Structure 1
Amino acid sequence: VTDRDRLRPPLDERSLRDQLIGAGSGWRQLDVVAQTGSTNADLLARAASGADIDGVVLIAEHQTAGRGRHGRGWAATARAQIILSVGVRVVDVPVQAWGWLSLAAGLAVLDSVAPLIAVPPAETGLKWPNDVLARGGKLAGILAEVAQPFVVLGVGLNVTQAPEEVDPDATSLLDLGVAAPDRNRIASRLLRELEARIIQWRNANPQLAADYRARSLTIGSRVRVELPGGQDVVGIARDIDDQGRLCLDVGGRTVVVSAGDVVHLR
């Protein structure tokens, strides 16, 4: 809406570089572009042309052809979200562990905005795989795409984004009660949390798995999992395995799912 613009000042690129790039930091490069098709696609194109995208951050004020999982899309209006992609070198890590990189990303996004919201802890957390949920609404979406030897990690976070402009099941920090959210503070806090989680993933830190289970909204609840190909499986989510796959209890039978859309059954 018109009035939400006034709550959307531009991102300060120079300020973000001062905080996030330098000694003690793993980020090598940060850029803020006014508009692009997809930040994921852009970093994928860089890697495809020989660039070392490891530790490289790309942020866009607006995204016109955003990507979702399973060939879906991601909607956004200008300066209403934090829209970024980072590059991570993953070739030194066993392929079976790559699934945890996505979960670690959602963990970092959650921790960056969790204190800002005034919602009971039982309805704020991660829906498997890495959907950031708050009061039943989707606060953020994460997308991981492979470009050897890199994985491009994409984060779309609704800051002042109006649900009516993107999705009925969507929510934002503004719609959660946060009056005047500062994208500069949040982006800085996000990328520092993200740096920590990536390092934890790369070193197989068990603290990573323990922190996910403590924030999981899926584990313990009855769910319907929409599998790739259009098949549905109803059961109770019990745990995450060593590959970041969801373990389902289906009438005593264990079903491990590597990919799919989870619906918490109310």
Structure 2
Amino acid sequence: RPPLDERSLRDQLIGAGSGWRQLDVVAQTGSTNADLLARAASGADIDGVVLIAEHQTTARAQIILSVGVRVVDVPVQAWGWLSLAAGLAVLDSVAPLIAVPPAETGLKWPNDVLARGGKLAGILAEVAQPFVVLGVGLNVTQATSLLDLGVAAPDRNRIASRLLRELEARIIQWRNANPQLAADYRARSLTIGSRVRVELPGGQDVVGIARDIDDQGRLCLDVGGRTVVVSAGDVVHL
């Protein structure tokens, strides 16, 4: 598997009106999210900073990265939309490469990108006020993978540039409260309109039809005409 070309990525992604300020690829680390968080704790401005790892403790079989996002300027109740924005960015980046009908892939609320029912990518947001660290893990040649979906020799450098472009685009929409973000999300949602079970602490299930995602990124269920909104956590598609 060819390596990521850090210099090419910088040349492409860093520039006057670009959102990205810094980009680094490391051979190995434990967790890119932990590293950006620890950079934040030590006083660095991590807004628009990108950290990509070839392997987190098979190397080069994924794209694994974290980006920093300053959130303190955005109402706190909107911060839940960042993980959603990131999933959409990921899907949009890879949907054109895969040999499966658009129908058929999409976003499983809150944190997963699916394709033919298998997990293609996952998003993890973690907060470090005034920042959020957004982590992305995309399955390239590893659940499913680009390879398993028909991409015979995925170009990880091109895919990384696409992903980061899309991520910046959606982060801008999010910062600007652009209603197009949520519209584009719902259009690619596998959860909305589906019957779902939410398994709650204490062996309490709630079963209903997912009707919407609210302005805080929460899942709105219809339970026999009553609305139940659930905070971020796993949900089971029925």
Query: Shorter-chain TM-score: which interval?
Result: over 0.9
Alpha carbons 1:98, 1:243 under 8 Å: kept: yes
Contact 2:26-2:52 within 8 A present in 1 as well: yes
Deviation at 1:115, TM superposition (A): 0.4
1:202-256 Cα offsets, whole Å, 9 max, x none, are 0000000110110000001111123356543211111111111101112222110
- Residue identity over aligned pairs, in percent, reads 100
- CA distance change for structure 1 residues 229 and 131 in 2, over 3 Å: closer, same or farther? farther
State whether residues 102 and 144 of structure 1, in contact with CA within 8 Å, keep that contact through their aligned partners in structure 2.
yes
Contact map agreement 1:30 1:57 (CA 8 A) in 2: yes
Query: 1:158 and 2:139 equivalent?
Result: yes
| Structure 1: distance between partners of 2:201 and 2:74 | 26
Q: Is contact 2:95–2:102 with CA below 8 Å preserved after alignment? A: no
Q: Distance in 2 between matches of 1:256 and 1:111?
A: 27
The answer to which of 144-153 and 222-231 deviates more is 222-231
Displacement, 1:24? 2.9
SS of 1:175's partner is helix
For residues 99-146 of structure 1, what are the alpha-carbon distances to aligned partners after superposition, in whole Å with 9 as ceiling and x for unaligned?
Answer: 011111111001000100111222211010131000000000000000
Match of 1:10 in 2: 3
**Contact persistence 1:58–1:85 (CA under 8 A):** yes
Measured in 1, the distance between the counterparts of 2:42 and 2:188 equals 38
State the secondary structure of the residue aligned to 1:248. Answer: strand
Give the drift of 1:41: 0.3
Q: Structure 1 pair 229/183, CA: closer, same or farther in 2 (3 Å)?
A: farther
Counterpart Cα distance in 2 of 1:172 and 1:28: 30
Which position in structure 1 is the counterpart of 2:122?
A: 141
For the aligned residue pairs, the C-alpha RMSD in angstroms reads: 1.1
- For structure 1, the 5+ residue unaligned runs are 1-7, 65-76, 162-169
Deviation per residue, 1:41-89 (Å, 9 max, x gap): 000000001000000000000001xxxxxxxxxxxx2110000000000
Q: Is the 1:140–1:156 Cα contact (8 Å) retained in structure 2?
A: yes
What's the CA shift string for 1:135-167, capped at 9, x where partnerless? 000000000000011000000000111xxxxxx
The C-alpha deviation readout for 1:2-37, integer Å capped at 9, x for no partner, is xxxxxx211111111111112331111000000111
Q: What is the number of equivalent residue pairs in this alignment? A: 238
Q: Which runs of 5+ in 2 are unaligned?
A: none
1:116 to 91, 97, 102: 97
Is the contact made by 1:89 and 1:151 (CA closer than 8 Å) also made in structure 2? yes
Whether the 8 Å contact between 1:88 and 1:153 is mirrored in structure 2 is yes
Any conservation in 2 of the 1:228–1:260 contact (CA below 8 Å)?
no
Shift in CA distance, 147/228, structure 1 to aligned 2, threshold 3 Å:
farther
Most deviating of 143-152 and 114-123: 114-123
* Contact residue 27 and residue 55 of structure 2 kept, 8 A: yes
Report if aligned partners of 1:227, 1:260 keep a CA contact under 8 Å in 2: no
Report which stretch shifted further, 204-213 or 243-252. Answer: 243-252
- Distance of aligned partners of 1:24 and 1:230 in 2 relative to their CA distance in 1, 3 Å threshold: farther
Partner residue in 1 for 2:236? 263
TM-score, normalised with respect to structure 2? 0.97
Q: Please say if residues 228 and 259 of structure 1, whose CA atoms lie closer than 8 Å, have aligned partners that are also in contact.
A: no
CA contact (8 A) 2:212 2:220 kept: yes
CA 1:143–1:228 in 2, change beyond 3 Å: closer, same or farther?
A: farther
